[PDB]
PDB file of C-alpha atoms and ligand atoms in Angstrom:
ATOM      1  CA  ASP A   1     111.910 168.661  35.626  1.00  0.00           C
ATOM      2  CA  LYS A   2     108.620 170.516  34.394  1.00  0.00           C
ATOM      3  CA  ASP A   3     109.995 173.811  33.203  1.00  0.00           C
ATOM      4  CA  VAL A   4     111.869 174.099  29.815  1.00  0.00           C
ATOM      5  CA  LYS A   5     115.609 174.115  29.869  1.00  0.00           C
ATOM      6  CA  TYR A   6     116.192 177.513  31.572  1.00  0.00           C
ATOM      7  CA  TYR A   7     120.157 177.529  31.760  1.00  0.00           C
ATOM      8  CA  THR A   8     122.223 180.422  33.571  1.00  0.00           C
ATOM      9  CA  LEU A   9     124.925 182.502  32.185  1.00  0.00           C
ATOM     10  CA  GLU A  10     127.763 180.621  33.972  1.00  0.00           C
ATOM     11  CA  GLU A  11     126.297 177.248  32.790  1.00  0.00           C
ATOM     12  CA  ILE A  12     126.007 178.364  29.120  1.00  0.00           C
ATOM     13  CA  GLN A  13     129.398 180.094  29.502  1.00  0.00           C
ATOM     14  CA  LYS A  14     130.812 176.595  30.266  1.00  0.00           C
ATOM     15  CA  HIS A  15     129.205 175.291  27.067  1.00  0.00           C
ATOM     16  CA  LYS A  16     131.792 176.924  24.899  1.00  0.00           C
ATOM     17  CA  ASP A  17     134.870 174.657  24.874  1.00  0.00           C
ATOM     18  CA  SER A  18     136.112 171.232  24.050  1.00  0.00           C
ATOM     19  CA  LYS A  19     133.493 170.610  21.394  1.00  0.00           C
ATOM     20  CA  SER A  20     130.226 172.310  22.626  1.00  0.00           C
ATOM     21  CA  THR A  21     129.619 175.707  21.263  1.00  0.00           C
ATOM     22  CA  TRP A  22     126.342 177.234  22.593  1.00  0.00           C
ATOM     23  CA  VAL A  23     125.318 180.855  22.054  1.00  0.00           C
ATOM     24  CA  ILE A  24     122.401 182.953  23.926  1.00  0.00           C
ATOM     25  CA  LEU A  25     120.617 184.733  21.195  1.00  0.00           C
ATOM     26  CA  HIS A  26     117.581 186.796  22.534  1.00  0.00           C
ATOM     27  CA  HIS A  27     115.565 185.582  25.469  1.00  0.00           C
ATOM     28  CA  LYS A  28     116.465 181.919  24.471  1.00  0.00           C
ATOM     29  CA  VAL A  29     119.484 179.526  24.371  1.00  0.00           C
ATOM     30  CA  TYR A  30     120.714 177.788  21.166  1.00  0.00           C
ATOM     31  CA  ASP A  31     122.999 174.839  20.728  1.00  0.00           C
ATOM     32  CA  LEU A  32     124.877 174.914  17.453  1.00  0.00           C
ATOM     33  CA  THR A  33     127.425 172.161  18.197  1.00  0.00           C
ATOM     34  CA  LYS A  34     126.153 169.976  15.306  1.00  0.00           C
ATOM     35  CA  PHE A  35     125.510 173.348  13.261  1.00  0.00           C
ATOM     36  CA  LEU A  36     129.084 174.654  13.305  1.00  0.00           C
ATOM     37  CA  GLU A  37     129.892 173.652   9.491  1.00  0.00           C
ATOM     38  CA  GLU A  38     126.299 173.322   8.552  1.00  0.00           C
ATOM     39  CA  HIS A  39     125.685 177.080   9.205  1.00  0.00           C
ATOM     40  CA  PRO A  40     125.610 178.773   5.868  1.00  0.00           C
ATOM     41  CA  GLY A  41     128.339 181.256   6.865  1.00  0.00           C
ATOM     42  CA  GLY A  42     130.743 179.052   8.659  1.00  0.00           C
ATOM     43  CA  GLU A  43     131.961 177.527  11.931  1.00  0.00           C
ATOM     44  CA  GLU A  44     134.556 180.079  13.006  1.00  0.00           C
ATOM     45  CA  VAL A  45     132.163 183.219  12.653  1.00  0.00           C
ATOM     46  CA  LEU A  46     129.768 181.164  14.852  1.00  0.00           C
ATOM     47  CA  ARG A  47     132.397 179.941  17.378  1.00  0.00           C
ATOM     48  CA  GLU A  48     134.117 183.358  17.448  1.00  0.00           C
ATOM     49  CA  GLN A  49     132.438 184.323  20.800  1.00  0.00           C
ATOM     50  CA  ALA A  50     130.333 181.316  21.968  1.00  0.00           C
ATOM     51  CA  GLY A  51     128.708 180.899  25.461  1.00  0.00           C
ATOM     52  CA  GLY A  52     127.633 184.621  25.766  1.00  0.00           C
ATOM     53  CA  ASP A  53     125.357 187.035  23.967  1.00  0.00           C
ATOM     54  CA  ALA A  54     125.862 186.659  20.335  1.00  0.00           C
ATOM     55  CA  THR A  55     122.698 188.364  19.796  1.00  0.00           C
ATOM     56  CA  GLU A  56     124.390 191.678  19.119  1.00  0.00           C
ATOM     57  CA  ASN A  57     126.611 189.959  16.451  1.00  0.00           C
ATOM     58  CA  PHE A  58     123.595 188.064  14.968  1.00  0.00           C
ATOM     59  CA  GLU A  59     121.588 191.310  14.873  1.00  0.00           C
ATOM     60  CA  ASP A  60     124.404 193.278  13.426  1.00  0.00           C
ATOM     61  CA  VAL A  61     124.364 191.090  10.428  1.00  0.00           C
ATOM     62  CA  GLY A  62     120.538 191.029  10.885  1.00  0.00           C
ATOM     63  CA  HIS A  63     119.969 187.561   9.356  1.00  0.00           C
ATOM     64  CA  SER A  64     117.022 186.461   7.195  1.00  0.00           C
ATOM     65  CA  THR A  65     113.862 185.238   8.636  1.00  0.00           C
ATOM     66  CA  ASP A  66     114.876 181.592   7.792  1.00  0.00           C
ATOM     67  CA  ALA A  67     117.475 181.980  10.442  1.00  0.00           C
ATOM     68  CA  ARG A  68     114.750 183.126  13.084  1.00  0.00           C
ATOM     69  CA  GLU A  69     112.891 179.880  12.407  1.00  0.00           C
ATOM     70  CA  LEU A  70     115.915 177.652  12.066  1.00  0.00           C
ATOM     71  CA  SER A  71     117.164 179.225  15.374  1.00  0.00           C
ATOM     72  CA  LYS A  72     113.881 177.628  16.930  1.00  0.00           C
ATOM     73  CA  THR A  73     114.837 174.279  15.502  1.00  0.00           C
ATOM     74  CA  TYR A  74     118.183 174.664  17.586  1.00  0.00           C
ATOM     75  CA  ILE A  75     116.299 175.929  20.805  1.00  0.00           C
ATOM     76  CA  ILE A  76     117.373 173.696  23.684  1.00  0.00           C
ATOM     77  CA  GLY A  77     115.824 175.908  26.336  1.00  0.00           C
ATOM     78  CA  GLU A  78     115.899 179.455  27.607  1.00  0.00           C
ATOM     79  CA  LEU A  79     117.934 182.035  29.562  1.00  0.00           C
ATOM     80  CA  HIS A  80     117.612 181.620  33.317  1.00  0.00           C
ATOM     81  CA  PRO A  81     114.833 183.939  34.969  1.00  0.00           C
ATOM     82  CA  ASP A  82     117.679 185.343  37.072  1.00  0.00           C
ATOM     83  CA  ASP A  83     119.388 187.607  34.478  1.00  0.00           C
ATOM     84  CA  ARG A  84     115.829 188.482  33.281  1.00  0.00           C
ATOM     85  CA  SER A  85     115.101 191.534  35.630  1.00  0.00           C
ATOM     86  CA  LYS A  86     118.124 192.879  33.697  1.00  0.00           C
ATOM     87  CA  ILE A  87     118.076 191.507  30.097  1.00  0.00           C
ATOM     88  CA  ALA A  88     120.711 194.299  29.430  1.00  0.00           C
ATOM     89  CA  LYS A  89     124.127 192.605  28.954  1.00  0.00           C
ATOM     90  CA  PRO A  90     126.923 194.916  27.917  1.00  0.00           C
ATOM     91  CA  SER A  91     129.498 192.677  26.074  1.00  0.00           C
ATOM     92  CA  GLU A  92     131.649 192.932  23.049  1.00  0.00           C
ATOM     93  CA  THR A  93     130.151 194.472  19.851  1.00  0.00           C
ATOM     94  CA  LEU A  94     132.878 193.349  17.388  1.00  0.00           C
TER      95      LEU A  94
HETATM   96  C1  LIG B   1     120.593 180.726  15.958  1.00  0.00           C
HETATM   97  C2  LIG B   1     121.844 180.553  15.505  1.00  0.00           C
HETATM   98  C3  LIG B   1     121.990 180.939  13.898  1.00  0.00           C
HETATM   99  C4  LIG B   1     121.415 180.512  12.846  1.00  0.00           C
HETATM  100  C5  LIG B   1     120.187 179.260  12.782  1.00  0.00           C
HETATM  101  C6  LIG B   1     121.881 181.021  11.629  1.00  0.00           C
HETATM  102  C7  LIG B   1     121.455 180.802  10.384  1.00  0.00           C
HETATM  103  C8  LIG B   1     122.088 181.514   9.232  1.00  0.00           C
HETATM  104  C9  LIG B   1     121.600 181.266   7.858  1.00  0.00           C
HETATM  105  C10 LIG B   1     120.398 180.644   7.650  1.00  0.00           C
HETATM  106  C11 LIG B   1     122.474 182.169   7.184  1.00  0.00           C
HETATM  107  C12 LIG B   1     122.325 182.356   5.648  1.00  0.00           C
HETATM  108  C13 LIG B   1     121.854 183.767   5.473  1.00  0.00           C
HETATM  109  C14 LIG B   1     120.288 183.980   5.582  1.00  0.00           C
HETATM  110  O1  LIG B   1     120.008 183.934   6.746  1.00  0.00           O
HETATM  111  O2  LIG B   1     119.684 184.270   4.702  1.00  0.00           O
HETATM  112  C15 LIG B   1     123.464 182.624   8.068  1.00  0.00           C
HETATM  113  C16 LIG B   1     124.459 183.422   7.542  1.00  0.00           C
HETATM  114  C17 LIG B   1     125.402 184.083   8.290  1.00  0.00           C
HETATM  115  N1  LIG B   1     125.611 184.081   9.663  1.00  0.00           N
HETATM  116 FE1  LIG B   1     124.218 182.847  10.960  1.00  0.00          FE
HETATM  117  N2  LIG B   1     122.816 181.840  12.178  1.00  0.00           N
HETATM  118  C18 LIG B   1     123.040 181.802  13.494  1.00  0.00           C
HETATM  119  C19 LIG B   1     123.814 182.564  14.355  1.00  0.00           C
HETATM  120  C20 LIG B   1     124.855 183.384  13.915  1.00  0.00           C
HETATM  121  C21 LIG B   1     125.838 184.103  14.733  1.00  0.00           C
HETATM  122  C22 LIG B   1     125.723 184.083  16.228  1.00  0.00           C
HETATM  123  C23 LIG B   1     126.900 184.659  13.807  1.00  0.00           C
HETATM  124  C24 LIG B   1     127.790 185.672  14.354  1.00  0.00           C
HETATM  125  C25 LIG B   1     128.696 185.348  15.491  1.00  0.00           C
HETATM  126  C26 LIG B   1     126.459 184.406  12.557  1.00  0.00           C
HETATM  127  C27 LIG B   1     126.970 184.959  11.425  1.00  0.00           C
HETATM  128  C28 LIG B   1     126.644 184.874  10.105  1.00  0.00           C
HETATM  129  C29 LIG B   1     127.211 185.302   9.042  1.00  0.00           C
HETATM  130  C30 LIG B   1     128.502 186.131   8.893  1.00  0.00           C
HETATM  131  C31 LIG B   1     126.552 184.892   7.879  1.00  0.00           C
HETATM  132  C32 LIG B   1     126.721 185.333   6.436  1.00  0.00           C
HETATM  133  C33 LIG B   1     127.829 184.568   5.664  1.00  0.00           C
HETATM  134  C34 LIG B   1     128.390 185.188   4.481  1.00  0.00           C
HETATM  135  O3  LIG B   1     127.448 185.784   3.764  1.00  0.00           O
HETATM  136  O4  LIG B   1     129.596 185.281   4.343  1.00  0.00           O
HETATM  137  N3  LIG B   1     125.333 183.586  12.584  1.00  0.00           N
HETATM  138  N4  LIG B   1     123.254 182.263   9.225  1.00  0.00           N
END
């Protein structure tokens, strides 16, 4: 296609099992499937939610700017323009 990798909530929510753990973090989508162990913090903490707004979780901990750039290195594509009129996504806080 010509657009980026705009993926929908349902699709991303399917990328959280078997051995594909995605997370949506801000207005973009990140594959961390080969970052699980590599993540300086762990797999489990990262796979805890998966395929949902982990933004709240990521922002709770805040993260250093290193992570904000390294995040871009994991950028597969973006959150579909569908759920963009309402970025608001009430989910688990933890
Ligand atoms: C874009 C995806 C992410 C990247 C690239 C990333 C990167 C990093 C990096 C570089 C660190 C080391 C601390 C620092 O930033 O200076 C870190 C630590 C950590 N991250 Fe992430 N992270 C991501 C997503 C997440 C998410 C969604 C969670 C929560 C569900 C999480 C939980 C943690 C925790 C708990 C630590 C601290 C470990 C500890 O001190 O015990 N991270 N992350």
